[PDB]
Amino acid sequence: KKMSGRAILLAGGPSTGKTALALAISQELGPKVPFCPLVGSELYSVEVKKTETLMENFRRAIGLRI
């Protein structure tokens, strides 16, 4: 909980466990930490621009306990 904006991607052929790796990361992190899954095609909305949707997901990604 120190860094911010770190960006990694996992690259490989089909049927190699990339989505499985992401799901395992999410499940190991725990239900406390928010985790937003998405596909590339969701960013093409109808009523708002693509960048606004991406920023909405960015804001949705982090959480606050009060």
Partner 1 sequence: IEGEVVEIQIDRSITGGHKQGKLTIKTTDMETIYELGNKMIDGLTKEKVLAGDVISIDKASGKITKLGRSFAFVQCPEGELQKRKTVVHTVSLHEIDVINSRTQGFLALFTGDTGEIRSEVR
Partner 2 sequence: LNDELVLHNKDGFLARQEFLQRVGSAEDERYKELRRQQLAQQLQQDSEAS
Partner 3 sequence: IYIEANTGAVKRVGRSDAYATEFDLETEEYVPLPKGEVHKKKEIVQDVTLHDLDVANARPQGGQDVISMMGQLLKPKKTEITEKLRQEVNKVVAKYIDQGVAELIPGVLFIDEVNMLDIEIFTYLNKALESN
Ligand X SMILES: Nc1ncnc2c1ncn2[C@@H]1O[C@H](COP(=O)(O)OP(=O)(O)O)[C@@H](O)[C@H]1O
Annotated binding site for ATP: which residue ranges?
Answer: 12-19
Which member of 31, 40, 59, 64 binds partner 2 (CB under 8 A)? 31
Of 4, 64, 59, the closest CA to residue 33 belongs to 64
By CB under 6 A, residue 14 contacts ligand X: yes
Reduced 3-state DSSP string for 43-58: HCCCCCCHHHHHHHHH
For the bound state, the minimum distance from the C-beta of residue 55 to ligand X, rounded and expressed in Å, comes to: 27
Within 8 A by CB and 6+ apart from 45, the residues are 53
Nearer to partner 3, 13 or 66 (CB): 66
List residues binding ligand X (CB under 6 A).
Answer: 14-20
